[PDB]
């Protein structure tokens, strides 16, 4: 009786939100950006090849200086690369080799990683002993760690396969805030540039916008038909793009609270692993299961170019803070650095 | 062309490369085994004989180092991390023979033995384990014999025309799992009957792994 009545009210509320979004859907982003000229053909060459991982690479993250990057592989090795020289700065042996994510702190003093061990491990890069040591092991998730991102040297946000995200106080080792509401495994998260909000994509084919300080879900974004594997904020923080197993990328708007554009092709039938934007946000770069990275026109939904330099899945990618280059990691155990030429 | 500090940084990178190569060679020699099986299937008892996320068991037997990975504690979506174990030497699957007449606790309407069949079929026919052999442990054989006298296989298998002898009942269950193998040429299934008092379970894994290693070398050379 009471349960049946309540679940009917949820359907009424869902229709109310859907009608509200349709009311403000006066135009389409495709119609708005029809007049602007296309980006043309985007040609990028492999400037660097980072060799040394002996297993599948699962994650990479640039440092804020746009020169150092950290990559994680399931050979149990965290490697920090000097991208200008291809020098290996550090090689961190992981206690658990089943790593799925890695993060570089914006200060450059810490890196984080974690996988099927349900732990986010923090590594100190600047010690008087000259070696990288574990500074914290963040326990509390009951599923695998899918993504982690530093807010500063003391705070980090993690998403897990137990359907929840958590905000951690690194010094105390406790999760100050728990973000619940996903009905599937949360696979990725992206921080807003001001680090006051973050979006997360789960296997319930939905993306939720969370307030870091308040600790509740502000908005929920649906439209995907399969699990979301990747998510990335637009450079101004007012939009984000997702990548799913349905071979599509979608651009959702925070203020319009709805999807704005879909990035899919008929030839593309494989899942998407990673998404990122160029510095101006005009380009959307996505890594795919078909061993390729497709560069999309964010405004016009046109495939601007292809990065074809890997013999297995493109598992991760990232664009430097200065926008100079893009790195692609792959299951073939190699990292490649790309940029164009005049 | 390089400065004094640049040359020293390159030398440090070379030392890191040397250490990465040594670790990879050591890892390649070890045998990786994925330990699978439903709950209350005797899988925990197997680990003790072999002596909150993933549990890794390390043991050595006849100069062979084994790394067994237990993933039963993980309750998340299997398809999001099952590809992480692509490349293991073999998969060890545990099935409790005494659970043929039992009913799944959560579902209350699904046979416990039939629950393992759909799990075995998914793993055996998984795209990530096309060329991976499977070691099948049929546990609780002593308890299975006791239940056979009271409860026949007709409850678990309505379309069973065999007798109720211990040997015939156990053999039929083994053939049921091996028939789920939709790729009988790329992979092989090794079936063993285990018990809590058995001490030859480690030897069977070693013999099965040795057979997998030999066939891997023959396939690599292109002979197969």
């Amino acid at each position, epitope marked *: 009786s009471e349960l049946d009545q309540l679940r009917q009210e949820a359907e009424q509320l869902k229709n109310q939100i859907r009608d509200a979004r349709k009311a403000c859907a006066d135009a389409t982003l495709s119609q708005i950006t029809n007049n602007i000229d296309p980006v043309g053909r985007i040609q990028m060459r492999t400037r660097r090849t980072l060799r040394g991982h002996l297993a599948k690479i699962y994650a990479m993250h640039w440092g804020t200086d746009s020169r150092l990057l950290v990559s994680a592989s399931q050979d149990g090795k965290l490697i920090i690369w000097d991208s200008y*020289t291809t020098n290996k700065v550090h090689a961190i042996p992981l206690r658990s080799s089943w790593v799925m994510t890695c993060a570089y702190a914006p200060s450059g003093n810490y890196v984080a990683c974690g996988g099927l061990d349900n732990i986010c491990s923090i590594y100190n890069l600047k010690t008087r002993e000259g070696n990288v040591r574990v500074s914290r092991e963040l326990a509390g998730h009951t599923g695998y760690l899918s993504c982690c991102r530093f807010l500063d040297d003391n705070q980090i946000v993690t998403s897990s396969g137990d359907t929840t995200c958590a905000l951690w106080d690194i010094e105390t080792g406790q999760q100050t805030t728990t973000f619940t509401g996903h009905t599937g495994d949360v696979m990725s998260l992206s921080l807003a540039p001001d680090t006051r909000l973050f979006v997360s994509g789960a296997c319930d084919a939905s993306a939720k916008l969370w307030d870091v300080r308040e600790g509740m879900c502000r908005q929920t974004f649906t439209g995907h038909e399969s699990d979301i594997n990747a998510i990335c904020f637009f450079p101004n923080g007012n939009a984000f793009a997702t990548g799913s197993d349905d071979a599509t990328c979608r651009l959702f708007d925070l203020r319009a609270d709805q999807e704005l554009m879909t990035y899919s092709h008929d030839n593309i039938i494989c899942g998407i692993t990673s998404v990122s934007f160029s510095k101006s946000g005009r380009l959307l770069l996505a890594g795919y299961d078909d061993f390729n990275c497709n560069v999309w026109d964010a405004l016009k939904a046109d495939r601007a170019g292809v990065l074809a330099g890997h013999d297995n899945r493109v598992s991760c990618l990232g664009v430097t803070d200065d926008g100079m280059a893009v790195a692609t990691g792959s299951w073939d155990s190699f990292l490649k650095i790309w940029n164009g030429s005049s | 062309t390089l*400065s*004094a500090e640049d040359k*020293a*940084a390159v*030398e440090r990178s070379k*030392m890191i490369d040397r250490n990465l190569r040594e670790d990879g060679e050591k890892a390649a020699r070890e045998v990786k085994l994925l330990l699978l099986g439903a709950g209350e299937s005797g899988k925990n008892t197997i680990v003790k004989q072999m002596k909150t996320g993933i549990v890794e068991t390390h043991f050595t037997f006849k100069d062979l180092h084994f790394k067994m990975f237990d993933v039963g504690a993980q309750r998340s979506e299997r398809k999001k991390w099952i590809h992480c174990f692509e490349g293991v030497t073999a998969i060890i699957f545990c099935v409790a023979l005494s659970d043929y007449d039992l009913v799944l606790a959560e579902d209350e309407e699904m046979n416990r033995m039939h629950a393992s069949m759909k799990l075995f079929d998914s793993i055996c026919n998984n795209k990530w384990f096309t060329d991976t052999s499977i070691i099948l442990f049929l546990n609780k054989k002593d308890l299975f014999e006791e239940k056979i006298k009271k409860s026949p296989l007709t409850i678990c298998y309505p379309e069973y025309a065999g007798s109720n002898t211990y040997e015939e009942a156990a053999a039929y269950i083994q053939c049921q799992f091996e028939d789920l193998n939709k790729r009988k040429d790329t992979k092989e299934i090794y079936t063993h009957f285990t018990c809590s008092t058995d001490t030859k379970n480690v030897q069977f894994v070693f013999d099965a792994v040795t057979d997998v290693i030999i066939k891997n070398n023959l396939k690599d050379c292109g002979l197969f």
Partner: single-chain antibody
Amino acid sequence: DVQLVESGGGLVQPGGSRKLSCSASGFAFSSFGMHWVRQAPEKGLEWVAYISSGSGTIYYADTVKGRFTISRDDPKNTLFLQMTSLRSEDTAMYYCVRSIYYYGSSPFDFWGQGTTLTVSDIVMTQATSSVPVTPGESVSISCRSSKSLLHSNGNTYLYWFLQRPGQSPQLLIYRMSNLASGVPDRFSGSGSGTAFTLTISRLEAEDVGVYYCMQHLEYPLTFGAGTKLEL
């Protein structure tokens, strides 16, 4: 804590042999390259030798090449300096210096206490030998080099050290602008090409000492004469 203890120094006869040891504790010894730096009594610093991490690269100063042998024992965390045919020119305090090299590292960051031995090329110039100073006042120290220390990679391999009276040298500024760990922000290093300045805002009692500018562009590493601050 990070420690570097030297031993084996003492009075030796001319033409003799002596073995200096540097025991390291509290840090990953095998990860650091090691230098020997000596200082003649009432004189400036003089670089002696270098052995890299992993013992693959070894460099010597010309004045000691062929007579000195530098070696390390990574399992024992001990650095050695075998000296032969010792001359009166070798009478100095010999310092054990650790230095690690990767992008953004701070070489020459920690020095040992040193051991005293008594026996019976880019030019770095510090023309100002002494500078009278008062507490709370800003002081600038100048250094010059015969060659440009700015490399084509953008680094300017100039280092600043402070040797307080009775103490081992401490790193202040590495690569001409970066501030070493544990050094107050009042120290600032500024330079261009061949001319460099170390500015000390709001000088304090601890800052009193001799300041050395060292180049790390190429071997042999050379020190300036040193500028002394006195009250």
